[PDB]
Amino acid sequence: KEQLMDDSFIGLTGGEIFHEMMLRHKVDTVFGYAGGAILPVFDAIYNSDKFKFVLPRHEQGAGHMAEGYARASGKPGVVLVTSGPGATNVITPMADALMDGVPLVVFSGQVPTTAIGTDAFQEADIVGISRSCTKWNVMVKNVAELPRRINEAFEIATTGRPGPVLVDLPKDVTASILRESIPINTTLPSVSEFTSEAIKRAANILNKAKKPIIYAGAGILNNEQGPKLLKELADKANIPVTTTLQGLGAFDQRDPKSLDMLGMHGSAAANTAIQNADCIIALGARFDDRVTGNISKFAPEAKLAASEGRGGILHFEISPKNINKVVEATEAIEGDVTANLQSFIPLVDSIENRPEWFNKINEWKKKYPYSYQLETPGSLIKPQTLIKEISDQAQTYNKEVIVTTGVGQHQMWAAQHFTWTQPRTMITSGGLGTMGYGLPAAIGAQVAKPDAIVIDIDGDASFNMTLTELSSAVQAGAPIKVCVLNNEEQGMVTQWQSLFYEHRYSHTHQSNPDFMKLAESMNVKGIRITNQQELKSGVKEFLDATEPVLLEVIVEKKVPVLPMVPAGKALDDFILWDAEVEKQQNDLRKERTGGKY
Amino acid sequence: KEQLMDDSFIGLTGGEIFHEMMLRHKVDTVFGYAGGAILPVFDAIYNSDKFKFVLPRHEQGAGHMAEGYARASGKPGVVLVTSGPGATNVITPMADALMDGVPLVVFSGQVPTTAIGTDAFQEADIVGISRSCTKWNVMVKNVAELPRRINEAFEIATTGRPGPVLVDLPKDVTASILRESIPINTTLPSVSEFTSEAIKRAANILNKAKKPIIYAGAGILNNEQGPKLLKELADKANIPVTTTLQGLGAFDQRDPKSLDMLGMHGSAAANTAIQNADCIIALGARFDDRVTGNISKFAPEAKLAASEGRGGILHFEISPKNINKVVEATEAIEGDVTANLQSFIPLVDSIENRPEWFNKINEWKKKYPYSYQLETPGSLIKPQTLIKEISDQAQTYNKEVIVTTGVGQHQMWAAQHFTWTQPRTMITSGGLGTMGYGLPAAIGAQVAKPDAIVIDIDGDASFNMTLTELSSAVQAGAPIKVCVLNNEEQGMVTQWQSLFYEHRYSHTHQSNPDFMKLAESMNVKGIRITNQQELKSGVKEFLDATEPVLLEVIVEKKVPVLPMVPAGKALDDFILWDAEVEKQQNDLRKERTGGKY
Amino acid sequence: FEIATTGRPGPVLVDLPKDVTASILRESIPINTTLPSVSEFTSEAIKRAANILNKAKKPIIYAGAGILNNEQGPKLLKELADKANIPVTTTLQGLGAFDQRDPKSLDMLGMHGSAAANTAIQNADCIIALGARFDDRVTGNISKFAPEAKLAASEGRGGILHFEISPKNINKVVEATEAIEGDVTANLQSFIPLVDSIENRPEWFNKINEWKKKYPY
């Protein structure tokens, strides 16, 4: 009994217990912001040398920083904020983390238990508000249960599909002192025959396939061996590989078997290949509606193969909720994709050549490059060209390169035109798609990986959302590299307004600050590229900098991201770039807007 | 039947119907930000000349702007945002509006009804998330019900205790076209014997009182005749008047009967008077826990009088939920306080003099001024002095003057040291207490009242939260006046850390940008006051400006807001300013921090 | 089981999916999960409560279901009533907590309670609420409830002493002059020794006995 109970926390405040549990969970970084209700915890962590504390300018900043940290490091991102508005300000980052499967542990101060439900000063019902944007949450009601709840939070955040959790900390609980012993288990952190048979059946199906394709996503990144086993499978059975936006970097795009990204703005070669494949191996991807195109018209050849007993969809998925949610799996392989790949690959036959399939694959790649209208004499820099320049120069350094983005056209062009080669190097808001993510995510990733080059490829409207966090990067010592693609428009929305609303640009042009004076005011280096002849040397200065730096690039306006699978269309029913079409579109836009755009 | 149905909307899209209903509800301003799911509504309002559209840099900005607009104008603040993160970004302003009783009508785009519940692109469960921070919300499910739901929203937002509502607008609903007639009532906007007897009993109680006091709050501001009837009552029955933070401006503070603000940081004269009053007339105030002090020790003399049948608490309250919630009312007068005052006052006896009560009142006012340590040769400007300077110079213009604030010490000093004389001139986050409120609220108030001087008295940490909205003020043509009290600290938190945590300043010093370069980058005039000899002329330049302007003032650091009723103490158990005590505290802080603070 | 039986006891539900109850445990589990299981603040409140009762000239015990939740509850209730010479009324749910045959029994109070019990609580200067929640079948019109105890509280010579285990039910309906948080039986063990022994209350019990005589059922 004495062996099962622990007295070592007796005499500590809840805040002190919190501090000790952070250490036991190997937390090396906390992102947060103080306030009245969370003071007992801030007093306990005062001058701690046990972890780095990162102070944002806004709690949304703390949230997205913790996300960037978690995606760069594979560890949970820990957030510590006060009650009321400190807590409600973390709602967008929590919903973001939930949609993108990001392990976030949010600790929010709360008014004393005696004031809850009285419309108290700085009281929000954050447990109610965050229910739908967390995997789980709880309000701690006494200090004796605080260690158990902290263990529970970290365990839930990091198991199954990773995601956000919230633990609410009333001020009287964190100020109270533990007076009683607690179970010692609470003071420390931590293949079915059914699945084994599904794996065997899956292998037998793949061994019949004549047109296989791997559709790989974020889940493969959640194990360090993931990308290795993906390559091992693709190499053994000779299978072309496409990834989602969130799977970018899971497979070496330089490899001949790389089909690049699929989906709404993915390669027409990848989209064509998945529409014609007789066997689809879905590895840690959830068939999102930006990827599938028209669901009823998705993967016709794999559905036919399944019906004829010679292919189908093999779905390696850790969360049962996402199995058979969108598309019917021919075989569902439940659990960690990397673990299940270790069992799968040895049952898979080695294949030397697939001459007709790869003849088709190579023909599609050749006819469907990411084409766009190149610069002409006197024109502005094209945003596609800028991305290529950054990608080509960044790979010259002897350092890891991590990219974060905002949301919009710049995000899609970054996805398309960067060459992705390493896991956890694309850190982008995909499911919720939060403008403003890019800068704080970069700071969080830079803190996780202090020897990495971290580049925030950002849109001007996105950057405007959270640009106050530039001060935070300086104060944290995070030498991030922000590149603002300044088209002076919410380009992704003007793209839709051009295509579907006859060039009626309804409130999609926000005015920008002077980004060079802004950088100066924030004590950040500033570079501005305004013409084609400054692109190369300006990008070099940007990447050579050893301090935080903001690069502004003036780029062409009103240019669409192509290819594009419009809403309602099948994945292989895409719009492609055409020079003459673009020219006509420009003329039509000019006429319709009286020359304003 | 034809007389009761209406066909006039047949053939319009949901977006077009939205637009027409804004007009029918006399909306003259919409605050919002575009995105994919709300495009059909943005297309319908394209180039509308029916209202002004205000574009922020962040949807939180739109939310707080709409709040500032509503509090300045008495009209609901209308917000229009997209799905997913556009919607979750309005959660803090909704919780803010709920706590402070602000009529907000939030319209959020949503993914098509066919995608709801599928973890769709940019899908949040905003109806679930916002349930607890709205009076009411709804998801519109077909276009035929869109006019009814819009009417419902405006009606709920503006009746009872005003507050926020949310209406969720799926993209397929707002793109769909009305094909059927709808009830014509849905296409147009819009004293019990029990209460009458309570009013009579209330008058009889007041007519017995020998030490009455009026405790007036935000509710009195919700009717244009409110302040007039408050004055009429105070004048007739010869009653001293104290207000909450949110009631500031309900009563002319220049009047001899003014006791100023009560509460945690209110006047010790007001706090003493309410602790000794035999009759408390609570007019549109909710007995918040920043006001009452220790509840069991609150208003002892009024409780005694009630028990002896010669006084008590007379609570004029519109929301039954807030009657007898905190303190027992001797008489509850349910409904609009202004309407019920019209019945009340004629039953109230006219009183010429109250010599002993006003002898006490005048003695308390004399001994309890808002004292503080004045400037000395070479010292920094004191923040209390700055506020007095602004208040004195602002009243020289022939214009209305509206003040918004951030949250913290600067907010309390603004409340204490301004002289409040007019209704709806103090626009401040009180119940939720949201840092970052000040700048966007000012923009919203300036749009509501374009001929007013609007001054955001802001803290440096608060201002950092949302400073990107400076661009928004320029783009909106709102010549707001921002005064940043730069103490380089989260002063309200360092005040608590000094007093209760032995000068352990745990993460309460955020680094600031260069505010003058920041202003320049945002195309805003900048003024910096760094010493005592620049205060007068700098404040004059600030107020004389006819364009948006940011004033930075360097002020004394580590100075507490006094008086202060510490948590747990009775309202009349306050800390007062003492020169020697302040000196000792400075010496102790210097010793404990090794001279750092 | 722990939640059901601690604090204010109440119902809990555990939902058991068929595939979980048919599945077989394949992994070890923490051994703690395979086995079942006075603050200075409250101590000071108890002392203040005793000082208030020691001033009372018209005390009454209002006892409810909470006193039944400890086997020693009724014993300590009797010990208190006997020591300080206090009449006892109970709720419907407290029936049987006190021997109704005892001369100090006022019977049940409330909507259909004895008019003697109802009269006594309306005239008492000190009300000792033991494990009872001031339900709306018991209090009658809340604003008119316990006028003499409210007056005594304001004059610093009585009031309501509420022994309650669930903070949610403290100051929910009526303001407690002293709130004594936790198990009523445990807190009575501390309380009674601080309470002065009283031999007679001639005028109060003269009123009590007159009310019982004129208000039978």
Ligand SMILES: Cc1cc2nc3c(=O)[nH]c(=O)nc-3n(C[C@H](O)[C@H](O)[C@H](O)COP(=O)(O)OP(=O)(O)OC[C@H]3O[C@@H](n4cnc5c(N)ncnc54)[C@H](O)[C@@H]3O)c2cc1C
């Ligand atoms: C403007 C914009 C345009 C976009 N267009 C595209 C586009 O064209 N193409 C595109 O791909 N995306 C696009 N997106 C992003 C898209 O919305 C989704 O975010 C993304 O496709 C999801 O990719 P994913 O399935 O790999 O990742 P996730 O959403 O994180 O899903 C991962 C899946 O793997 C599972 N999983 C997690 N861990 C494991 C494990 N250890 N083992 C097994 N399974 C696991 C998860 O439970 C989940 O089901 C766009 C986003 C924006 C903002």
Ligand SMILES: Cc1cc2nc3c(=O)[nH]c(=O)nc-3n(C[C@H](O)[C@H](O)[C@H](O)COP(=O)(O)OP(=O)(O)OC[C@H]3O[C@@H](n4cnc5c(N)ncnc54)[C@H](O)[C@@H]3O)c2cc1C
């Ligand atoms: C750092 C900080 C310190 C603070 N310290 C203080 C302080 O010292 N003193 C202080 O006063 N505040 C202080 N506050 C603010 C405090 O938290 C509350 O916000 C404020 O006191 C509420 O004032 P109120 O009751 O008048 O307004 P509200 O909270 O809006 O309540 C108004 C009440 O009137 C009712 N009502 C509304 N309309 C009508 C109507 N037409 N007729 C009748 N009734 C109506 C409402 O239903 C409600 O019950 C502080 C805030 C901060 C951030």
Ligand SMILES: Cc1cc2nc3c(=O)[nH]c(=O)nc-3n(C[C@H](O)[C@H](O)[C@H](O)COP(=O)(O)OP(=O)(O)OC[C@H]3O[C@@H](n4cnc5c(N)ncnc54)[C@H](O)[C@@H]3O)c2cc1C
């Ligand atoms: C037709 C009808 C008529 C009724 N009329 C009457 C009437 O006239 N008179 C009457 O009395 N009732 C009447 N009732 C019943 C009434 O509605 C309530 O059910 C009852 O009065 C509650 O009694 P109680 O407070 O003792 O019990 P409970 O409702 O169980 O409350 C017990 C309280 O003690 C607390 N408590 C529990 N355990 C402990 C502990 N260990 N230590 C300290 N505190 C503890 C609880 O948290 C709770 O606050 C009537 C019911 C019906 C159906």
Ligand SMILES: COC(=O)c1ccccc1CS(=O)(=O)NC(=O)Nc1nc(OC)cc(OC)n1
């Ligand atoms: C955050 O509010 C609470 O924690 C709270 C709410 C309701 C009831 C009781 C409390 C605890 S408290 O009264 O002691 N206030 C407190 O802890 N912090 C506190 N901090 C300030 O700035 C740091 C300013 C301030 O009131 C202006 N209150």
Ligand SMILES: COC(=O)c1ccccc1CS(=O)(=O)NC(=O)Nc1nc(OC)cc(OC)n1
């Ligand atoms: C906002 O998402 C939706 O409205 C949605 C979500 C799930 C299923 C269907 C829809 C409607 S949609 O597929 O037609 N997309 C849409 O309306 N807007 C849209 N806007 C973009 O930028 C303006 C970019 C973009 O995908 C990258 N989608």
Ligand SMILES: C/C(NCc1cnc(C)nc1N)=C(/S)CCOP(=O)([O-])OP(=O)([O-])O
């Ligand atoms: C308004 C909007 N989307 C809706 C929206 C609104 N609000 C938020 C917080 N997030 C999103 N995604 C976009 S993508 C425009 C982004 O503009 P940008 O940051 O300048 O990027 P770009 O011009 O490259 O498309």
Ligand SMILES: C/C(NCc1cnc(C)nc1N)=C(/S)CCOP(=O)([O-])OP(=O)([O-])O
């Ligand atoms: C951190 C904090 N309060 C907790 C907090 C945290 N986060 C938010 C969004 N709001 C609040 N109210 C305060 S009041 C400090 C404010 O500092 P300031 O804006 O520089 O003002 P001042 O120094 O005058 O007190």
Ligand SMILES: [K+]
């Ligand atoms: K690429």
Ligand SMILES: [K+]
């Ligand atoms: K004043």
Ligand SMILES: [Mg+2]
């Ligand atoms: Mg842009």
Ligand SMILES: [Mg+2]
């Ligand atoms: Mg400050």
